[PDB]
Design a protein around this ligand. Structure first.
Ligand SMILES: CC(C)COC(=O)c1[nH]c2ccc(F)cc2c1-c1cn(CC2CCN(CCNS(=O)(=O)c3ccc(CC(C)C)cc3)CC2)nn1
Length: 329
């Protein structure tokens, strides 16, 4: 069968913590008073939750209430446990309270409020510098959670909340995140299609934090080339097709060899032969003000089939692309 794998960094971080740190199944939830919050207006909805602006009538503080739809109790315990473990880390959304409606009995998480409502315009007026800066803030959060033994597994634009007025950014929706344990085999059905890593697409289950680094690359690429989504895949098979027509197929079959991955016979007829394209081809007159040698050298080191050879968050944070942002701080 397939050749095993381990994270290059933070490998045994959880082995060294006490059991309860990662054994979320045994975590008991500190519920609270659902009557301290009142819903003002709805802010969004998704397959696993509906999000409201709310006010804590205890302190007048405005707040975000995320009402969970039916999942397994352990999935909830998982999100709750990861959020508490990460509370206070750089640019992690703060879980404030945990309440359950008395009659409905649907659980809900209560978070610090981050002012977004600005995204659409902000998305197409970020300067080259804004992008470097906000990418640096994301990496701060990824490095933290990785060092804390946690994969996010759903890195993507909509899971980043930016109040540009206060250059403030939080990484949200930890519903998909797990703890990394060496030699564990994880579910490949995670993350949005356009951001799924090659390991998930070919069904290699012993993946790790470097999965988030791939998704960062896709985020970065669409921002700097002004192409959303970058890898515009019709479904999970054609998404590996779309990657291969940029990264080339030779590096892909090398990846498959090295880890002795068993390709779904479906891919046989659709992966083709494709050379590895030069990034220059995505550069046109309307995005070139966000494209630079440093940005492309950076991008190329995130988007590798071989998850072991992608930049780690800390390593990313040191790349030349970020010299100017680091100099300001
Ligand atoms: C929606 C549910 C399905 C799940 O919800 C939550 O789980 C949730 N949980 C919260 C906790 C606290 C809270 F305060 C809100 C929330 C929310 C929550 C969710 N939505 C909805 C969208 C959130 C993202 N918006 C813009 C995208 N990011 S963006 O513009 O800021 C940007 C800029 C630029 C980039 C480029 C990079 C260089 C950075 C990327 C992203 C669109 C609206 N609203 N609130």
């Amino acid at each position: 069968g397939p050749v095993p794998s381990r994270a290059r960094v933070y490998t045994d971080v959880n082995t060294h913590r006490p059991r309860e740190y990662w054994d979320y199944e045994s975590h008991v939830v500190e519920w609270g008073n659902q009557d301290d919050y009142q819903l003002v207006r709805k802010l969004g909805r998704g397959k696993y939750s509906e999000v409201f602006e709310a006010i804590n009538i205890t302190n007048n503080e405005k707040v975000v209430v995320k009402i969970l739809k039916p999942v397994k109790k352990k999935k909830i315990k998982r999100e709750i446990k990861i959020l508490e473990n990460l509370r206070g880390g750089p640019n992690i959304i703060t879980l404030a309270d945990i309440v359950k409606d008395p009659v409905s009995r649907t659980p809900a998480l209560v978070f610090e409020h981050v002012n977004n409502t600005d995204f659409k315009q902000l998305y197409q007026t970020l300067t080259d510098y804004d992008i470097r800066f906000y990418m640096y803030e994301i990496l701060k959060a990824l490095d933290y959670c990785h060092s804390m033994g946690i994969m996010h597994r759903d890195v993507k634009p909509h899971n980043v909340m930016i109040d540009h007025e206060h250059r403030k950014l939080r990484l949200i929706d930890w519903g998909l995140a797990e703890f990394y344990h060496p030699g564990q085999e994880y579910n490949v059905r995670v993350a949005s299609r356009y951001f799924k890593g090659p390991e998930l697409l070919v069904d290699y289950q012993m993946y790790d934090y470097s999965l988030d680094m791939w998704s960062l690359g896709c985020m970065l690429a669409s921002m700097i080339f002004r192409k959303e989504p970058f890898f515009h895949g019709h479904d999970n098979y054609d998404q590996l097709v779309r990657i291969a027509k940029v990264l080339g197929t030779e590096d892909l079959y090398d990846y498959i060899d090295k880890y002795n991955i068993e390709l779904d016979p479906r891919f046989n007829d659709i992966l083709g032969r494709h050379s590895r394209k030069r990034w220059e081809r995505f550069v046109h007159s309307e995005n070139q003000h966000l494209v630079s040698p440093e940005a492309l050298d950076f991008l190329d080191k995130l988007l590798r089939y071989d998850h072991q050879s992608r930049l780690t968050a800390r390593e990313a944070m040191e790349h030349p692309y970020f010299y100017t942002v680091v100099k300001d701080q």
